[PDB]
Design a protein around this ligand. Structure first.
Ligand code: ZN
Length: 525
């Protein structure tokens, strides 16, 4: 007799419950209790309102299952199913109505894109799974924390002639911060990631719009799923983790540090800005966002005024191979290594990539596009937050992660700290100077209008090129606070938000919640 284990709960950093189990009524039948099992299901079909899906799944498991095995026929029965079965109960001996545990998401939409959903164990999963371990377990993780920590959450089964519960997860995410971040993207497409730069802990992760993951737990009706999948605003899509955007001017502060590293520029190195750059012999004029230019432009001026010319000149000297090596140290161009499924690589374009994908050689014009966060350069909001955290913490590499603690019997190693330091040929002062530049983006630069009187925000705005709404430019903001001892770095992508200054507006409340509110009046359920 197998006794399947209780799935472990998922909490927040403060112990706010985000996923539990509640009991429901489930129609089981045992192979020991039923001869001629194939006929019995055809009878129970109209009694329990079984669909062709619910049916096939039962026969799938009962073949690959033991005797004392309790194979579920329908899960979380409706009051009607209970009644209709109850009427003819003793015409099916051995077919029991049993108290089994379903999965619930108390704040479904809020953490859908982090926690995800469990669902019924399909046929593909059955052929990859230890049948003895998942004996009498009906639900398995499909996406989010529920998939990425399936084993840790599952538990170990027992018997009678004692089962081990799944481990509890405490996420690094904060209920209150997740609420405030979600509020800002209410009725808007985009994404907000907050990271603790000291650790790589994700404090908030919002893709907008969201969805109810409770719809998926005990099957989703093809009506409800097709509304979500065919919806134009794409709510099932994780813009924070899978979504990739041109980072635009957000990547300039890090590329400037690359300038200092390779010894190409220093803080004083200035350029004549005519509002364009030309490559030797090339006719194509690569235009500054402001076609009059910014005059005599040093590093500080290039950051506060987002000068494209400074970075066209810097990148041309640096070259794509040295831009790859350097920018990849901030997380760009490969998976950040987050403990969630389906993370996108992004793309930092390189010559080897060009020779595989376009079977063409690399042209020095393509370097210039990449220098201002355009060309084929695409980044996840995850990547942009990581890069910001690394800028904030003076080059300590952090791995974005949602798992803070796990309590239970299963042993587990939890990352809590940075995994390395970038060898940087400048000094610690070069990171402090770049912080002051980024404070001045907020004070007297491109991100004016999101200033606070209680703490300093370092930041950098950007825009990205894509139904008179959906074709508008995306607004991007990266930043961190309190600037001198960073606690939180944020990346905002407001899809069709037009200006990075707009995206910055969405970050101030997230920063404010974390640094002012949460100590006195924390948002609780
Ligand atoms: Zn300029």
């Amino acid at each position: 007799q197998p006794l399947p284990p209780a799935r472990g709960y998922i909490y927040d950093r403060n112990g706010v419950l985000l996923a539990d189990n509640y009991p429901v009524f489930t129609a089981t039948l045992s192979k020991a209790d039923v001869e001629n099992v194939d006929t019995v299901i055809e009878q129970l079909q109209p009694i329990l309102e079984l669909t062709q899906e619910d049916v096939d799944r039962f026969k799938s498991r009962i073949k690959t299952a033991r005797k004392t095995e309790r194979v579920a026929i329908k899960l979380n029965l409706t009051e009607t199913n209970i009644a209709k079965f109850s009427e003819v109960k003793y015409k099916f001996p051995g077919v029991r109505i049993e108290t089994q545990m379903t999965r619930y998401y108390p704040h479904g939409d809020l953490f859908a894109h982090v926690i995800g959903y469990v669902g019924r164990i399909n046929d593909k999963e059955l052929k990859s799974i230890d049948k003895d371990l998942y004996a009498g377990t009906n639900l398995i993780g499909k996406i989010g924390v529920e998939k990425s920590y399936e084993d840790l959450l599952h538990g170990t089964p027992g018997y009678e002639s004692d089962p081990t519960r799944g481990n509890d997860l405490y996420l690094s995410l904060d209920y209150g911060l997740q609420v405030v971040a979600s509020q800002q993207l209410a009725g808007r497409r985009g994404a907000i990631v907050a990271i603790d730069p000291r650790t790589g802990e994700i404090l908030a992760l919002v893709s907008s719009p969201s969805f109810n993951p409770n719809l998926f737990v005990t099957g989703i009706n093809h009506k409800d799923y097709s509304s979500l999948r065919d919806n134009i605003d794409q709510p099932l899509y994780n813009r924070a983790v899978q979504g990739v955007y041109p980072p635009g001017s957000t990547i300039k502060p890090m590329e400037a540090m690359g300038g200092l590293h390779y010894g190409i520029v220093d803080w004083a190195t200035a350029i004549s800005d005519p509002g364009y750059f030309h490559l030797p012999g090339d006719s194509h004029k690569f235009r500054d966002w402001k076609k009059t230019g910014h005059g005599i432009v040093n590093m500080h001026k290039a950051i506060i005024m987002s000068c494209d010319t400074y970075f066209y000149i810097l990148a041309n000297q640096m070259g794509i191979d040295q831009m790859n090596q350097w920018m990849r140290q901030f997380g760009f161009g490969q998976k950040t290594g987050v403990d969630l499924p389906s993370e996108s690589e992004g793309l930092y374009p390189n010559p080897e990539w060009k020779m595989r994908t376009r079977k063409s050689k690399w042209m020095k014009g393509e370097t210039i596009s990449v220098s201002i966060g355009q060309g084929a350069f695409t980044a996840t909001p995850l990547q942009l937050a990581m890069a910001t955290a690394i800028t904030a913490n003076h080059g300590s590499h952090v791995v974005p992660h949602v798992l803070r603690a796990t309590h239970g019997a299963k042993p587990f190693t939890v990352r809590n700290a940075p995994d390395g330091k970038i060898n940087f040929n400048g000094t610690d002062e070069d990171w402090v100077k770049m912080r002051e530049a980024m404070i001045d983006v907020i004070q007297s630069g491109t991100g004016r209008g999101i200033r606070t009187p209680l703490y300093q925000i370092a930041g950098k705005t950007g825009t990205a090129q894509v139904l008179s709404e959906r074709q508008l430019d995306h607004g991007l903001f990266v930043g961190f606070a309190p600037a001198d001892k960073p606690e939180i770095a944020i990346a905002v992508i407001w899809e069709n938000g037009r200006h990075g200054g707009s995206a910055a507006q969405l970050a101030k409340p997230v920063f404010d919640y974390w640094l002012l509110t949460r100590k006195k009046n924390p948002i609780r359920p």
